[PDB]
Structure formats: C-alpha cells, structure tokens
Amino acid sequence: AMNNTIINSLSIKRSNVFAVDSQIPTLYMPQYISLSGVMTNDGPDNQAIASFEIRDQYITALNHLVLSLELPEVKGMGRFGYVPYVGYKCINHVSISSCNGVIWEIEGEELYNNCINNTIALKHSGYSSELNDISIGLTPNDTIKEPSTVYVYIKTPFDVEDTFSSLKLSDSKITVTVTFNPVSDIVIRDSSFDFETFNKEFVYVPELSFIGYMVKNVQIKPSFIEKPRRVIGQINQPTATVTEVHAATSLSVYTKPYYGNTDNKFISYPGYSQDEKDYIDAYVSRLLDDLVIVSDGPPTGYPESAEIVEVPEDGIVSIQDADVYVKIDNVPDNMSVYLHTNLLMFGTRKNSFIYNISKKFSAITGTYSDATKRTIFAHISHSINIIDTSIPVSLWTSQRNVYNGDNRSAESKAKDLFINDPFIKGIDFKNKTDIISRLEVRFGNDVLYSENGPISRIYNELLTKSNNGTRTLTFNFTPKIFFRPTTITANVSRGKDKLSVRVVYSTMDVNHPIYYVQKQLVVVCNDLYKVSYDQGVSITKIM
Amino acid sequence: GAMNNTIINSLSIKRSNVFAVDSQIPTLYMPQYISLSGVMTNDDNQAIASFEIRDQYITALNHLVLSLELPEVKGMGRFGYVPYVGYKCINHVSISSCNGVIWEIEGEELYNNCINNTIALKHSGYSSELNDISIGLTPNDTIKEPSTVYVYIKTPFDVEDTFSSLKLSDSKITVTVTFNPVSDIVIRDSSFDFETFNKEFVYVPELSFIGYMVKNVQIKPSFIEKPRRVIGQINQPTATVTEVHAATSLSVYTKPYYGNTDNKFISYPGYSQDEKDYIDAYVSRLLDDLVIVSDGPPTGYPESAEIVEVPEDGIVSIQDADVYVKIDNVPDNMSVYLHTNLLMFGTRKNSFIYNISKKFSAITGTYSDATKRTIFAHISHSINIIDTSIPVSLWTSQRNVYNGDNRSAESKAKDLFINDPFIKGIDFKNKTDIISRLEVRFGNDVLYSENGPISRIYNELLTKSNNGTRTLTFNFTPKIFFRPTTITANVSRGKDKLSVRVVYSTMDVNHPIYYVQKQLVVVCNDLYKVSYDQGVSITKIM
Amino acid sequence: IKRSNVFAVDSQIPTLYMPQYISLSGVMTNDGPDNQAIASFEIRDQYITALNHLVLSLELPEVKGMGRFGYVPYVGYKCINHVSISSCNGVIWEIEGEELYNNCINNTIALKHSGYSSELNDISIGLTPNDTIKEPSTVYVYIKTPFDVEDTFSSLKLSDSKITVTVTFNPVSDIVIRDSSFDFETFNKEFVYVPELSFIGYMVKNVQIKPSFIEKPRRVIGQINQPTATVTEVHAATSLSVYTKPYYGNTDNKFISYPGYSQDEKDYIDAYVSRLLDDLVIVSDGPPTGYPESAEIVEVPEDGIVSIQDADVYVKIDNVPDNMSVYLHTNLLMFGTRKNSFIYNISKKFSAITGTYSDATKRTIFAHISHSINIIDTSIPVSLWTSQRNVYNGDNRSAESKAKDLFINDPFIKGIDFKNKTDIISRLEVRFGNDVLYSENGPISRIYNELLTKSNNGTRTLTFNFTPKIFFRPTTITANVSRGKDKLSVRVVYSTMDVNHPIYYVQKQLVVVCNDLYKVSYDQGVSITKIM
C-alpha cells in the first residue's frame, strides 16, 4: 500500500511526534452557574445597575462570563426595533472586583469592540430580523416585538487560556457589577411609538452565568492582566492625553459622532440588513415616494418651498446642471408625472452652492398601478451614499440653512426614526468615511509614532483578523499568559509618563449637512497590572 | 533613523528567548494519501462497506475521507438530494482491530461533529446541481448527472495531527461503514419512480486516509472519547444513559418522528437553505391556489373549499382576519378570487380553527395577458418555519374535523417526500425550541438544571459553532496532552446513570404541529484508555 | 498522583524589545525586463534588530475619461509580479506574485485590504473626456512571509546587515478590465505604480540569535498544452502543488460579460444572461435589422414556443404594440467544426423568457429566465467563438453588443473558467526520479488540501511535512541522487470534451510549485542555504 520509493528513502536525539505522555491534570469539576442579580437605580441619572456576588466554597475559579437579558413583549402602536447586537449596546460598564478593590473593568463600547470579530458572540447578543427589523404596531394591543432572551459574552482576560488564565477566587468574595445604558440607546422607534410609557415600564432583567471550577488543592501562582481605560476628547478637539502611562501593552485611537445638537432623528433605517448598500437602498426607498409623483394636476400636501415640476415629454427634468430622467409607465390620461426637484436642500448662503438630494438622482423608471393608486419603481440610477443616510434630520432644518430644507411630505416625516446607538464610530452609520488625515502619538514630549494613512489600522485588522479595527499601536507581541507582556515603559524623570494623541481631521464642505455632525476622539489605553492572591485577590499597577 | 528616538532611548535578569527557537528534530516519518475500495455486503439488508488496512509499512493513520459515487438519474418526476448528501448516507461508522471496536459513531453524531466545518460539509455535497430539485420530462430525460462526494470522517485521531494518529502495532484495522437506505438522501415527488431507483441504486464507496510510515516509532498510550446515544420513547420527556463511569460531555437535543405520516411535504426550497428560503418556497407553492383570476367561480377545487370574489375595496374578512388582494390588469371578463381556507385544521366542530389562508394580510400583483397567470409583486404574510415543516397527512388526519387540504390536485401532486435522517426539533431549521426546562440527574441528585439554553450558548461559544446543542462539558483540559477530566460515578450510591427530564412547551391542539411526535436524544462521551500492548485495544475507564 | 497544574503558570520574562510600525518609500526604476516597474526598499537601520509582517501599499490614481473601466478583484495582489527579500549575501526569500496570492487566498481580511470593493471592482463608465471613472484610492497588500508564522520567534533577524525588499510589478493592463472605448493607450502611458513598504521592526536588547529553517516556494510552468512539468534539483521538499492555468495568447483577451464586484458563480452567469438578452429576444416592427446576415432571427409563433432543433424556447412578452412582434435570435452564438457535426448554440441553452415591453422607455423589461448557462459559457473568449476552427460565423450578436465586450488580463486565473470551478485534470502522476511517488484518479489530494487548510480554493497538493512549523525541523521528502531521485516530475491527463464546444480550444498550462527546505544562518550577516 505504500509506494516503493517512500519505503526506500526510510543516533540523533529525536522529539517524538507520534505519541506523548498524557499528563494527569489538576483535579477539578466544572459547572455552568447562573445568578440573579440585585438591581439598583442610582448612578447617574438613575441609571440601572446589576450586582452579582460570587462566593462559594466549591467555586475555586471562574471564567467565561455570559450575561442574559430578558427582553419584554412590546405591545402598542408605532414603529419599533432593537439596535443590532442589542445585548452589547445595553452595556455601559462592567466591573469585576474583590474586597481589595477592582480586578478588571471595561467600558461597554470597549467590550463590544473586543468581541466585534466574534460572529457567535455577536449573534448571541441579538442579531435577527425578529429583533432588528423595524416592526409596526397597528392597535394599542398589537404586538410589535415578542419576548426574547439575548446572551452577552463578557470576554475577560481570564478566557485566553481557559483554565490556565481563569480567575482564582480563593476565599474572597468576587462582585460583578454591570451598568446599563438607558433603554433609549438600544431602541429604534418613530414618533407614533409611545416611548414615554415604554421608558417607565421597561426594566432590565439580567442574569450572570459563568463557568465555575471546583478545584482540589489549587496551586496558585501570580499572573498579569491588561486593564483597558479610555479617554474621550473634548467635542471636536483633535487631541487627547492619557496620563500616568507606565507599562502599557497597546493604545487605540478612533472617532465617534456626537448627536447632542440634534433630536437624533433619521429619515431611514435598513433594519436587520446592515450592509452599506442596505443603508443606501433603505434611504432611496424612503425618498422615492415624494421624489416622483403621479398626480391629477400639481401635487398637493407639500411645503410652499417645494419646487415640484411636471416632467417634459422627453423625460428629462433639469435641476441646474443635473439632469434627471423620469419615465413611468401606465399613467392615467388625466394624470401627469412630477419630479420633486428639492426634496432635501441645504446651503449656508442665498444664491450660493446648494446640497440638493434631488440632484443625486439621474434616472427613475417605474410603472403606475391603477389597482393600488401608487407608483411601483423599477430601476434607480443615483449617487446616494452612506453619509446621506447618516445625516440627522435636525441638520436639514438648522438655523445655518438658508433654505426651508426638508420639503418631504408630512407622511414621510412621520416615518422618521430616532436612533441612539451608543457604539457608532466615525461620522456615518458604517464607519466608512476616514475623517482622520494624520495621527501623532507622543510619549511625554517626544514623538512615539506618526502616520499619514491608517497603516496602524491595517495592521490592527490583520493581526487580530478583524475587519472593524482601529488605529492601534501594539507593543506586546509576546504570547499571552505564558509570558509577562512587553510594554512601553515610562521614565517619569524625563516627563515620559503620558501618551498624547494629536490627529489632523480632514475638513468637509461647509455646505454639506454632514459638516455639522460633532466629532469625538476616543483614546483607549491598556495598562499592565500584576495579580496577587495573598489574602484576597488584588491587582497592582506595574511602574 | 527610522526607529524613532523614543523607542531607542528607553532600551541582568533571566529571560526566555522569544526571538529564536531551538529547532528540535522530529521523528523520521513519511506521509502518504492512500485510497482503498474495500468490499460491499448488503446484510433490513443494509449495505455495509468494510475496508481492511493491513500493511507492515503503515505505522499510523488519521483523516479518514469516504468518497461516494452518485449515479446519473434518468426518468420522469422531481428529484434532488438532501443537503450534505454524503453525511446523510452514513448510518454508522466503526474502526476496529482484532481486539474489537476501537472507535465507532452514529451517522447523525458524526454529522454533528462536523457541522461547523464548512469545507467538510461542502465536499459532502452541497450545490445547486446536487440539492436543487430537478424535474425529468421524458423517461430518458437526465435528472441528475453523475457526481462524486467526499465525506470527512472526523475521528479522535485528527485532533493533534501525527500526535493523535491511530497507531497500528502490526494489527489489522477494519473500517466498517453502514449506509442509510437511499430513501433517506433523496427528495422526490410522486411522479418519480422511486421503486426502480431504490432497487437499481448501489452505494459505491472508497476510503482514503493519510498513512504515516515511521522509523523507530515510540508508542505511548492515550485516551479516546467514544460517543454513545440514547433515544427516549416517542413523546417521552425523559431519557436515561446507563453505565456512566467517566464522561467528558453530555448533550441533549430533540428529533421529530414522522413514522406516523407519509413524510410528504407541500414545499421545499432546494439548495437555498435559509429560513427565509423555506418560508418563501412555501408561500410560493400556496399562492397558485390562494389568489385566482378566473372567469366566474374558480373550478377544480374541492367542495369544502370556500373561494370568494374579492370586493371592490380589496378586502376579504376571514372571520377576524382581513386579507387585502389587489391585482393589476385583470381582464374585463374576469374577477379576482381568494381561497379563504386553502389549509385548515380543527379538533372539535364549530370551535377553534387554524386556517393558513388567514396568515396572509396583503397580496398584490399583475395579471399577464400573455401567459394567463398572475405575477405577484408583494406579499405581507405571517407564515413561519413551522408551517413549512408540517407533513401533509397531518392536514388530513382523522383528528381534523375538516377536510383540511383544500388545494388543487395540481398543487397536491407537486408535494415532495423528505426523509432526511438528521432533522432536529420540530421544524426544518431546528429554529423553534420546544424545551422549556432541562434537568440532568446523576442518580437521585440533580447535577444540572437550566431554564433557557445557556448550555447551548456555551457550547456554541466554546466550539465556535452556529448550531450547537445543550451540552454539559466536563473536560476543559487540552486534548491529547492531558488525561481528559471526567465526571465520575458512585456505583455504591446509584450514581452511575444520567437521567434527563425536559419540560416541553405546551402547544395548541388545533395546530397540526401539535401532532408531530418528538424524541429526546442524549449523547454521552465515555472516556476510554487506548493501549498498544500486542495490537490496539481500548478499555472503558471505570 | 503527580499532577500538572492547569490552573496557573509561571510568567516567564521575555526578551526585552520594543516594536515599531515602519513605513518606507522606495526607489522606482522601470528597468527589468520588458521595462517592468521595480520598487526597491532598503532597510539599513542599526537599531532595527528583527522585522516581519510586510505590507505594501499602493496609491491608485484618479482615472478620468471615456469608456468602461474597472479593477480586477484583489487588485493589489494582482499587481505584484514578484517579491524578493535580499541581503548583502544574496536572496533570503522570494516568491512569484501568483504564489503569494495563493498563499493569502483564505485570508479574507488580507484580500479585502488589497482592494475588493464595488468602488474598485464594478465596471464604471465615463461619459465625457473629463468624467471621473474611478476616484483615487490606496490599497494594502500583505506580503506574507515565512517570518510571520510564530510572530517574534519566526521574525527575520537583520544582524547589522542591509536588507533590500524588491517588488516587480505586472504591467497595469493585467489589473484593469476595460472596453474598447476606454483610452488604454494613454492610461498605459500615464499610469505609474506608487508604492510604500511598511513592516513591523523590533529593537531587541541583547538578542540571542539561533539558526532556523524556511520553506521557499519555486515553480515551473509547462509549455502550452503540454501535460508535464519537471522540477529539478529537489533534495528536501516539504510540499508539491499542481494546478492549471489558461493561456489566452491565441486571443484578444476580450469577453462578452463580467459581473463586477459581485463574484459568485451565479453573478458571472447572470451578468452573461443580461448581455445576451438584449440581442436574444427582440420586440420589433418587422424583422429586426442591424444583425449579421448569418443570424437566424425568427418570429415567435402564437403558441409562444420556438423550436431550434429539439430545443424549445418559450417566449412571452407582455404589452407589445399592435404593429410590432416578438422575435427570438436562434443562433446568437454558435460553434461547429464540420457542416455535419454537433453545434454548440447558446440560444438552445434558454428554455423560457418572459417580460414586459415598456411604452415609456421603448425597451423590453425581462422578468424571468429559464436557462442552463454555466460558468464556462461566461469564460469563453470571444475569439474562440470566431476561431478558424468554426465553420460558422460564430458571433451573430449586434454591433452595439460587441462594442460592450471587455478586455480581461487577470494574471491569476486558474483552470478554464473564472471561478476555477471545472476540474480538467482527469488523472495525476508524480514521479521522484523514475519511480511513481503518487498517483490518483480523482482529486483526493485537493480534497485533502482544502480539508487540511480549511479552504475552498485548494490545489492538488502533496504535503510531506505534518510536523509543527518553527518549533521543529520540517519533515521533507529527501533525495538519493545516486538512484537518480533528485527530480519531481508531474504528468497529468486532461479530461476530454466534445471538440465542438468552444472551451475545448482554451490553451492550458501546467503549474508545479515545490517548497524546498533552506537553512537560515547568521554569520557574515543573514544567509540561506539549500538543504541537500
């Protein structure tokens, strides 16, 4: 059965790769353990906090925390849906602490970031058409969403090498404290939705699961742990500084939008489908019904500022230098076809440049239905983009706009949805646009790193096998757990105990509404700590 | 230089070199892919391939792959293969030496072990060629072209490549494969001549594996985890695994039993296997009979059918349910009709009724004068994955006080037999979860209890798998290099058996799904010690 | 018992080092060989002790003008003809562009960084001499090396020597999909490769270097339509791979259709069907004009069924003007080697065509198509349809349709179709010296390659090394020399086809890649040595 040339080609110490001594491991028994928590409503703005205390003589070690949430049935009228990954967006903060203090904590967004390359984790936290499409209730008793459980993997450093990295409790009490975002963050809804009643009646219903380990004659040794912390820059300020950086493993930079100067209302939302094209199509779809109207004489029901034009016989309406081709089939003899030529329009001066959403269409074809008295659109040529779909409606009607701005029908305006997702990066719903033009990191007062493209994000996505990375400077390339991490290391004497970030943002057109979306600079630092287990668990910052 | 002046600036302790390694020399060996045709036997007269590996120059092996030749399929009717056809072929696999069975597995259990291996699943046969339902129009028409599929037979010997490989100490290994009846892998309609197919079909297998020829092999013993399952009785919420002495893991799930039906179904989506795909195939098969454009009252439907003309406002009220039907370009001599009771079920006369027509809220379309048919544009409905998983015979069983299936004979004859051996839950996606609570008892004591599938969450999480099972894992130690950690019995105290009780969700007797029977499946992973003194042997740890 | 602690471990203090991401600009010379662009980067910093993780970035220019233009998917990898890492002792490692790509083909994120977006890869159309077809863009190419397998452990040590990374770029026509209207002559003149090299450098305090091994791939391409290839001086190989490439030299490299960014088999097929449909069913007032004379365009009968021999095409268009009829083009593409032979007729691969004529746009809007078009059909060069072998005219499409055909010169195509789906190797034989080392009647070696590497684009691969990398000396197939076993010879038998299918005339080339084991030593700087 072997070929003759192999057997013919077949003193030195030789390591055996066909057998190995199956070592007896530490004696232990694992258990999936679940805890109800205690819910308090204080800290801050009466924010909801869950606390779980872990102390059992048979739990010697734990890891792999997973948080459960019961989502209630949602009944009533209006449009309602959950943000994708709803269970993660719920989370404002997680702390693991002993009686000596805090062992490890994370900001909601950073936990989410760390799990973003984990499709399973993401799926478990709630990503489904059931949960994330925008349902509409038609009756005060109609069911919008059914009840549901979501599961949030609270990834910890204790999970890297399973039992080797687990958290050893000894005889100490470990408290896990979870702070929840306000339910407004996790919910997408329209004006008809009675959010006021929903807000009062909604309660967070959490449960903390984990893998406990009952361990005979546990042999503890000291370990190291990376604890993340982040600094949020002042609004639109292109700088932030992290103080007291003594032994850090990595440093990440990114941008968030800030929508406080707005009502957080958006024209459209794609629902469960989350691709860039989904976002764009959802937006086109919402505009199409005011964009091309089939009507008995001039269309009614629009603001006087609307400029609705009858389409010439050759199908071309000319909006300044923009040509829009409109051919609708099966149009009644008493009716004509109209193009709305300024459905949304923005400018900071009269008689200057204009951002006009209607000029972003070049062809609209479709067929009229006599049966349902509507136009069924077939093919659209346009240049709508992910930004357009990310513009809050408030910006269209702002005092900086010389135009009325929002010339949609009332019916369309009613369909607008509030979106308060807490984990948005960049300035568009997909973090597609790169608004950072240059990044500088200084250790003390000396330049540590500088780049003119996102070469650090490319390396981040590569080394972590992620397609949603960040501009990240990684200092630790040493394998976790089995080594002490490599860290950038302070002088303190020479002033080098702080990392300072300066980015150059690219500047947008002041006549595009996107210019007025506020930006925030997020800098996340991972500091090395030593873990000791001598009478209670404790950590110690490495200097 | 290019190294910034800060990194250079801040640069006698005992250190590990992370910038070089000692290249230690491995065992001198040489690998080879080997294929074998083996021998076939047919003794319910199930086919059994057996392959003997006897060669003094093969020290070890792993990575078994079984290939199967699928023959050309000629004739009339509708015919496709079940997704991942290769795995559904396999009833049982066993690896034995002269000293008995070294490792064996049920077909469904090997499928489950491979379910997160996309490549393995794709090689086994997942393609529109294989899995879309084709239709033959003449007795000499070709329905399916000859294909060859490859089934990766995952074994404990692959976990750590050469370290885990099954060693052969001059012993004769026999790999024995038991095949499900070909009924199980074929989705067909009534017009297909399955009788002739069933007798003409022959499983044509070849077993390949990676053999290793090793000089001066140095054998050591290892351990192996051998799966075992129990199936509770029909509709019992309990099942028990006896003789549990050293288990590494326990998993619980549910299968449906359709033995009380014909295993015929109204619709099937073919190669496209998403939940939305199943639903859409179903809505599509119903729509032919649901909304009819006709010259006077539509004909060819049973008398029990309630087909009514759509009023000029487009709304038909089926009891409390309002259906909107508006069709464009309908001829002046024709009207739009709606079948208000396409499928309907009830257990007591003039009481509660489940009526599939009521799960439509809006149906829009345009009549084609050129093809004499209605082309539908938008359907608002509430059909779900369960509706698509109902055997037709349940619509027409004696419990139904109605006729039940009010479809056209044209619709009825397109129904399909599905006999997939590996269905789970009570719907084709395994979406619906009918376990409301699960209890595992080691003896009289409760070992585990959960109120939601947190055990499946961990299973999926810890194995990176989208389709896990409610699984209790006892071993968190790395395989091969460590004696697996087990849960250990106490025979003295009756603690040598694992009993599982679940609380099934309570369903409505006026929904056909209520009558789909279910079985509890409990799989236990028993720890065995593999010994190599005079041949290969295994011993169940006690 | 004596038990190993699985609940805690000693934290070893590692070598003291600091890593830095380092980007460099290169020297570009358009010398070597056919005036091919070369980019040289010199790493000569005394404080860069080790490096790995090479990333090449490319600034792609704005593209202005007229016509249809797009970039091949994963454009950055397709740009690379060859990468070579060398030192003042010669070459340490080097790879051919296709093999680098092959090595990265299951690294989705690497592929995405290289340029795989609708911005890049859909075919765009410029409407005026100053219309912008593509915006400027920067892509990132992960030059994977043996030095990244085990991070700092596997890293390239510089040892106070001067490292030079050399990148040879394919001509830009390889990465561009264009029509005839696009001014490629000008573009070809003005386009310049604008490359920057990044890498992770390591400042190591008191580095303790040791020797190691390294697999260096090398390949042999057979002559056109010759089913054999030999690799010489094979003394210590860790693997051997066999695949097939098409040769399109007998050809203008033009194809009827291309799907764009969407790259699924079904996308290729639908893009094709859409292109044929404009000529396949025609709503016309009187017999359609503008077609070649060899075209057999017939009016669809009232029954709706047109019969092309034993092939029936059902065609119903809705809402057709009273003064026009519906026609079917019964031989849009046809191929036969004799007058009394089997004919391959693309119209016969359609069974049903429905749609609706639009009065407003005066064009037919197709609704549903029953057809049997396959991936091969879409991968047939137009030339082969009109080759001398074809006793028919071949291409009976409209002139408007033929204007839209696209040049494609992607250097990394394999097999004979655009998804490498069809296997054309029927039998495979591998000989070490004169003795058969391996043979197979089915693609079991490729099934294993896909299985063992978790890949759906594998190759027929003989793996000799099943030993963990870096931490052990790799297991190799080992020469004898005295018994003539210093040669790896591959012979394939290609599967046979009916000679009346155009794809039979696609020229094939056999590709054999051998991974030879090298020893890395660090005496007078870095040095590699071929194991014998």
Ligand SMILES: COc1cccc2c(N)ccnc12
């Ligand atoms: C998966 O097994 C391994 C991976 C990496 C390192 C080691 C090691 N140090 C000892 C034993 N096994 C190892």
